[PDB]
Design an enzyme around this catalytic site. Structure first.
Site, mmCIF file in Angstrom:
data_model
loop_
_atom_site.group_PDB
_atom_site.id
_atom_site.type_symbol
_atom_site.label_atom_id
_atom_site.label_comp_id
_atom_site.label_asym_id
_atom_site.label_seq_id
_atom_site.Cartn_x
_atom_site.Cartn_y
_atom_site.Cartn_z
ATOM 1 N N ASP A 1 -4.433 3.295 -4.494
ATOM 2 C CA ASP A 1 -3.149 3.876 -4.110
ATOM 3 C C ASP A 1 -2.842 5.157 -4.881
ATOM 4 O O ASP A 1 -2.264 6.092 -4.326
ATOM 5 C CB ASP A 1 -2.020 2.850 -4.281
ATOM 6 C CG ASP A 1 -2.184 1.634 -3.346
ATOM 7 O OD1 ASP A 1 -1.732 0.516 -3.690
ATOM 8 O OD2 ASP A 1 -2.781 1.789 -2.265
ATOM 9 N N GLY B 1 -15.362 3.353 -6.400
ATOM 10 C CA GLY B 1 -15.082 2.696 -7.670
ATOM 11 C C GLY B 1 -15.460 3.617 -8.810
ATOM 12 O O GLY B 1 -15.055 4.783 -8.824
ATOM 13 N N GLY C 1 0.806 -1.204 0.000
ATOM 14 C CA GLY C 1 0.000 0.000 0.000
ATOM 15 C C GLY C 1 0.839 1.252 0.000
ATOM 16 O O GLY C 1 0.785 2.032 -0.948
HETATM 17 N N1 LIG Z 1 -14.158 1.254 -12.844
HETATM 18 C C1 LIG Z 1 -13.670 2.655 -12.593
HETATM 19 N N2 LIG Z 1 -13.914 3.634 -13.485
HETATM 20 C C2 LIG Z 1 -13.480 4.899 -13.284
HETATM 21 N N3 LIG Z 1 -12.782 5.221 -12.185
HETATM 22 C C3 LIG Z 1 -12.501 4.284 -11.265
HETATM 23 C C4 LIG Z 1 -12.941 2.967 -11.443
HETATM 24 N N4 LIG Z 1 -12.514 2.268 -10.379
HETATM 25 C C5 LIG Z 1 -11.828 3.075 -9.539
HETATM 26 N N5 LIG Z 1 -11.837 4.298 -10.092
HETATM 27 C C6 LIG Z 1 -11.210 5.482 -9.526
HETATM 28 O O1 LIG Z 1 -10.291 5.069 -8.536
HETATM 29 C C7 LIG Z 1 -10.696 5.625 -7.268
HETATM 30 C C8 LIG Z 1 -10.424 4.613 -6.240
HETATM 31 O O2 LIG Z 1 -10.801 3.306 -6.537
HETATM 32 P P1 LIG Z 1 -11.739 2.479 -5.500
HETATM 33 O O3 LIG Z 1 -12.959 3.287 -5.072
HETATM 34 O O4 LIG Z 1 -12.099 1.176 -6.175
HETATM 35 O O5 LIG Z 1 -10.818 2.207 -4.288
HETATM 36 P P2 LIG Z 1 -10.083 0.935 -3.707
HETATM 37 O O6 LIG Z 1 -11.088 -0.264 -3.717
HETATM 38 O O7 LIG Z 1 -9.494 1.311 -2.329
HETATM 39 O O8 LIG Z 1 -8.885 0.636 -4.719
HETATM 40 P P3 LIG Z 1 -7.970 -0.601 -4.624
HETATM 41 O O9 LIG Z 1 -8.700 -1.873 -4.897
HETATM 42 O O10 LIG Z 1 -6.875 -0.381 -5.697
HETATM 43 O O11 LIG Z 1 -7.266 -0.588 -3.319
HETATM 44 C C9 LIG Z 1 -12.140 5.838 -7.467
HETATM 45 O O12 LIG Z 1 -12.636 6.773 -6.589
HETATM 46 C C10 LIG Z 1 -12.208 6.334 -8.847
HETATM 47 O O13 LIG Z 1 -11.812 7.646 -8.882
#
Ligand SMILES: Nc1ncnc2c1ncn2[C@@H]1O[C@H](COP(=O)(O)OP(=O)(O)OP(=O)(O)O)[C@@H](O)[C@H]1O
Ligand SMILES: Nc1ncnc2c1ncn2[C@@H]1O[C@H](COP(=O)(O)OP(=O)(O)OP(=O)(O)O)[C@@H](O)[C@H]1O
Ligand SMILES: Nc1ncnc2c1ncn2[C@@H]1O[C@H](COP(=O)(O)OP(=O)(O)OP(=O)(O)O)[C@@H](O)[C@H]1O
Ligand SMILES: Nc1ncnc2c1ncn2[C@@H]1O[C@H](COP(=O)(O)OP(=O)(O)OP(=O)(O)O)[C@@H](O)[C@H]1O
Ligand SMILES: Nc1ncnc2c1ncn2[C@@H]1O[C@H](COP(=O)(O)OP(=O)(O)OP(=O)(O)O)[C@@H](O)[C@H]1O
Ligand SMILES: Nc1ncnc2c1ncn2[C@@H]1O[C@H](COP(=O)(O)OP(=O)(O)OP(=O)(O)O)[C@@H](O)[C@H]1O
Ligand SMILES: Nc1ncnc2c1ncn2[C@@H]1O[C@H](COP(=O)(O)OP(=O)(O)OP(=O)(O)O)[C@@H](O)[C@H]1O
Ligand SMILES: Nc1ncnc2c1ncn2[C@@H]1O[C@H](COP(=O)(O)OP(=O)(O)OP(=O)(O)O)[C@@H](O)[C@H]1O
Ligand SMILES: [Cs+]
Ligand SMILES: [Cs+]
Ligand SMILES: [Cs+]
Ligand SMILES: [Cs+]
Ligand SMILES: [Mg+2]
Ligand SMILES: [Mg+2]
Ligand SMILES: [Mg+2]
Ligand SMILES: [Mg+2]
Ligand SMILES: [Mg+2]
Ligand SMILES: [Mg+2]
Ligand SMILES: [Mg+2]
Ligand SMILES: [Mg+2]
Lengths: 308, 309, 308, 309
Positions: free
Chosen positions: C256, C226, C40
């Site tokens: 990240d 997401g 991370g």
């Molecule tokens: N399918 C998507 N399309 C567009 N933007 C995305 C998508 N997925 C993630 N993002 C962008 O990435 C940011 C963070 O991703 P997410 O909300 O999935 O967090 P996370 O689950 O902590 O990530 P990770 O699994 O890498 O640790 C989102 O707020 C968004 O801005």
């Protein structure tokens, strides 16, 4: 040579389609399907045609799908004897995935039969002359009690019809309940369910097959073993036949091909060894072809010459 | 009975982990892995121990993973003779999926070997006494030209070491170019590549195996056929042995179990029939176990007695 | 601008490999892997470098795999401060399947830490000057009690170190136990576990985030959603930022990337709106790239200008 | 409030079945299927009923499957107007896998339509009164040239029928060539194909939608964006509506639910904002349910109130 008939209480009009990838949730766009005849006894009759013989398929047909099933068989020159059913002929789905070359096969039950449609089917069975062979193959559809299957087989046997059985589950047990079946072809899982015990020791398959013959349930038991070929058992003989070491492309239609071939040898009063060898030749010949294609005459002949 | 050694140019420290489902894109949370010895010759030596024999595993080991690999084998009482390598011992991954009971196996190349390290491995091999058996099994790691593998086998045979080969691709062709190999165990895919033709006709496998024996490349060729057993060929004999009709739980380790068994039979100067029978017994016994577990002595004995009845 | 450090108690040396198909049972032959830094806080520091800033990654490293991890970061010009650990740096696996274009990611725990190695890590953390920012991100490895994490954060906060937290499970609850965290970024599942209830109503995510701020556990909660972007919550503000309607290629590194970007804005004392917008810009910019590649400066800048 | 009709040139009688695992090669034993109405316009009419409105589904039906399709809709109290077709109504397959909870959807073409049958469908459409709404939704079946679809829409508009279009590929381009479409709902993929360029820049979707409005092809364009909601464009207005952050159970029926909702708003002469909000509410409400279930009234209301707060 004696006439050969097959019985399929649960036929289908199968769809074969192609899609580029497989994954869940989204719509998988599939090509316009190719329709093909489906069902145990129907495919046994088709395999017999491929091997140069003739067998009449008896089966219920319903609706436009049923008409197309009959139409396909006519184009294959497979003679039929059909009963018009109320419920429409159901469809199974074969999906070929282009990116992986894998095939997925979704098998659902056949259409329902009412008492009167089954009565008409039994009527066609009892028009078969003495000495002729009847292959009962496939699943049991909704609407048919197990005892009705056993009573049909009993009535057939009473007038000299020689019965061959390929089925599974309660339907298989019921077909063997009265006994004196000429030939039964369980695969390994089907044998295990039939004798109601797990077959985990080297000799278990042989002993389980022998126990069926010794009980008088079947005169001949041929346990098919996938790539290991088959083990045929008589009151006097036990024979294992292993296919040649050639890669299988698709296993679809292997069992029905083997059954059609053994049926023809049975019709010729061939030895047990000759019967099982020709069955393995046809089943394994079937595997040489992609997708749903059944055994060809030339491939079966070639493998049979090798086994001999 | 002669001493047995194995050589694994591409060993691994394998991780076996569990996860509830398998699907793409998302992170699959996997359990803390259980580590296991990996590599052709290494597994042949482990199967030989399960069958009651003893074989010394010769291999390069590097870094902390290599140390763990060595420690695991000592716990299994498998004798080793190692060369310390600069590049750290690599790891393959075995994933069991709980929801389906399926296993996924990701096989990556072994660590690199430099020319000095390969010469050190060569030195270990040439310390083997005349008449002893050496099983060379597994893939060829980065850093080793095929001509060096040919030279090692040629050098080893020059002084009475009896070589058994199980490999694939160009490494198998290179290993057989010398000729007079005591035993080679290609599977069907490996045989097709070795003779460079598709084997589509019923007699193709037998004829291909015979061609290898007749050309002098190998004294014995055992073509293993998965659930169909194996076909063994000599200058004198040709036999197929099919295993009993029992359900395969998992196929991992079948080939190495079979090779370990045949190696023990070779050491006892057994007949071709007895050798192939014991080989199929051990290979098929291996399948009876879940995951990566190798053949057990009792299961192998039971199948062999059946095959011998 | 204030200095930025990250802490990764469970780093990894990740392998990225390619194979033509995926299926069970058989050996899947995979290409020689490409090694990449994992963990991370390490990836947060890498994302920060991509966006033009600088952050020092603090982490334990063990064995040849640990040396290669440090080596990779040096080639990326990511400054590090490492503690030599006995247990070797573990490896996760990223598999790209050529036929389908799909990627499979197998995530296993990090290497164990003993009490003394954790003591050395805490020592490096407490060398960070007052006002500087520390991002604690990733899973908790074996060998570390939860209270040790909370005590580390408390000690850091006592000497003016500003803490940002991105984690999950018991580790996340423990990091928030004492409170006064500057910024926390749970995703939806992580938020639900943290407040210990299901979030099934339209307003639940907002209310759950607000409840964390109101309790004093965190000054800022940014719930990442997401493809729906993120919801940022302050004592005075609630802001939702949605990414532009552009197809995601791969989601690896999205969280990240977002955390690195928000960290930089926090270091600049940016508004909550500016912080969340830049975070969504970076996370979504990350998605534009295949496989494991993190956000680029130019893509983040372009999306940020759109959001603004 | 005006009458609403839908047109589905490619309807289906869909089978939904269950099986414990999914893997290739072997026979997958599937449960006796549950049959459900399928097809774009048909589902739009069903969603409209769930939302408390009424819409007449116009479609070709053939054979016993077609009879069952019609019978199912009568049970759901969806009015129909059908043309008997020679080719039997086709079936798509929805498979739920128990072990993973995943669903697989195999979508095959609709039954063939001959020229006589299409003229019969055209006749049904032209019986619709002036000022009423017609939603043309779904794929184009075999047997129908694209120029016939253009002619039907042109003929329908000539007499005051307000046309809403949801389709894809060449059928969507053909349906819009006429111009003056009241509403079109492409998703992102469909929009990219319609304007024939990849939409890779942040403003690309909005600019593409505006280009359609500005060219006169459609009065309103609502580009639906999956979990991101939708972007609605007028000659006057441009708005994006994002759904609340709630977990999607299953996405099946999202598009048709959204179109049904927007159609009802159009019938009420609602603002662009209210129309898109109700559309996203209905689409996202649909996702809250397992399998193929369409939006429910209460879930749609709850999301709409939130979006409207
Ligand atoms: N399918 C998507 N399309 C567009 N933007 C995305 C998508 N997925 C993630 N993002 C962008 O990435 C940011 C963070 O991703 P997410 O909300 O999935 O967090 P996370 O689950 O902590 O990530 P990770 O699994 O890498 O640790 C989102 O707020 C968004 O801005
Ligand atoms: N190559 C793929 N691998 C895995 N999953 C996929 C793949 N393609 C699509 N999906 C899944 O299907 C969902 C939607 O796919 P898609 O873009 O085809 O939309 P759709 O609803 O199936 O069809 P449509 O464009 O007609 O509306 C995605 O959210 C994703 O989960
Ligand atoms: N993988 C294979 N390789 C070679 N031959 C095969 C293979 N599978 C089946 N066969 C041949 O087909 C014969 C019958 O197939 P099998 O034992 O699988 O019966 P089955 O399960 O009843 O078939 P089915 O599933 O079609 O009903 C075998 O005895 C063998 O001759
Ligand atoms: N049970 C599942 N079946 C199929 N696909 C899944 C499943 N779970 C997750 N996915 C896919 O993986 C993506 C992310 O899943 P998940 O909720 O686990 O987030 P993550 O990024 O993998 O983990 P994290 O919570 O650590 O951020 C989803 O968008 C979905 O496409
Ligand atoms: N599905 C099976 N059922 C029964 N026995 C098997 C099966 N697969 C392998 N065996 C046994 O193991 C022996 C060796 O296996 P195989 O022919 O597959 O070699 P291999 O491909 O070299 O093995 P591996 O993949 O482990 O290296 C076979 O000859 C047979 O005895
Ligand atoms: N394209 C595929 N799709 C599904 N399953 C496959 C595919 N290819 C192989 N398998 C599975 O893997 C098993 C063996 O595959 P393979 O021929 O590669 O042998 P192997 O033991 O994995 O490798 P090797 O040739 O090195 O011994 C097969 O029995 C089959 O079940
Ligand atoms: N649970 C499973 N996971 C993965 N693959 C499977 C599984 N079950 C079966 N298969 C694959 O399908 C092939 C056949 O499986 P199965 O035992 O069901 O025979 P079948 O031909 O599908 O059915 P039947 O008993 O009616 O003949 C196997 O050889 C195997 O490759
Ligand atoms: N994963 C999701 N989460 C929340 N809402 C969703 C999701 N997917 C779709 N929706 C809602 O449904 C509406 C329509 O879905 P989408 O944009 O995917 O259209 P579509 O691809 O035409 O649907 P379909 O595949 O059923 O024809 C979206 O605008 C949104 O309101
Ligand atoms: Cs076939
Ligand atoms: Cs095993
Ligand atoms: Cs990425
Ligand atoms: Cs749904
Ligand atoms: Mg069968
Ligand atoms: Mg079978
Ligand atoms: Mg092998
Ligand atoms: Mg193998
Ligand atoms: Mg995250
Ligand atoms: Mg995530
Ligand atoms: Mg749609
Ligand atoms: Mg869609």
């Amino acid at each position: 040579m004696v006439r050969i008939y097959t019985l399929t209480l649960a036929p289908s009009l199968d769809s074969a389609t192609i899609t580029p990838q497989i994954y869940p949730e989204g719509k998988l766009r599939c090509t316009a399907p190719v329709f093909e005849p489906g069902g145990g006894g129907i495919n046994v009759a088709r395999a017999i045609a491929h091997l140069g013989g003739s067998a009449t398929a008896i089966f219920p047909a319903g609706g436009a799908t049923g008409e197309h099933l009959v139409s396909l068989l006519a184009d294959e020159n497979v003679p039929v004897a059909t009963v018009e059913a109320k419920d429409w002929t159901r469809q199974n789905l074969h999906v070929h995935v282009e990116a992986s070359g894998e095939q997925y096969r979704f098998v659902m039950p056949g259409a329902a039969l009412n008492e009167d449609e089954f009565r008409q089917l039994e009527e066609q069975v009892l028009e078969i002359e003495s000495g002729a062979i009847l292959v009962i193959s496939g699943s049991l559809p909704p609407g048919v009690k197990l005892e009705k299957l056993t009573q049909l087989i009993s009535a057939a046997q009473k007038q000299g019809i020689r019965c061959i059985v390929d089925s599974s589950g309660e339907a298989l047990s019921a077909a063997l309940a009265i006994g004196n079946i000429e030939l039964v072809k369980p695969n390994q899982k089907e044998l295990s369910a039939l004798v109601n015990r797990e077959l985990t020791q080297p000799d278990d398959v042989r002993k389980a097959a022998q126990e069926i013959v010794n009980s008088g349930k079947a005169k001949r038991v041929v346990v098919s073993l996938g790539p290991q070929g088959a083990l045929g058992v008589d009151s006097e003989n036990c024979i294992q036949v292993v296919p040649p070491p050639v890669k299988s492309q698709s296993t679809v239609g292997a069992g029905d091909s083997m059954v059609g071939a053994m049926t023809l040898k049975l019709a010729e009063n061939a030895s047990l060894e000759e019967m099982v060898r020709f069955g393995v030749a046809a089943g394994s010949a079937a595997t040489l072809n992609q997708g749903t294609r059944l055994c060809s005459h030339d491939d079966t002949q070639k493998i049979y010459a090798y086994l001999s």
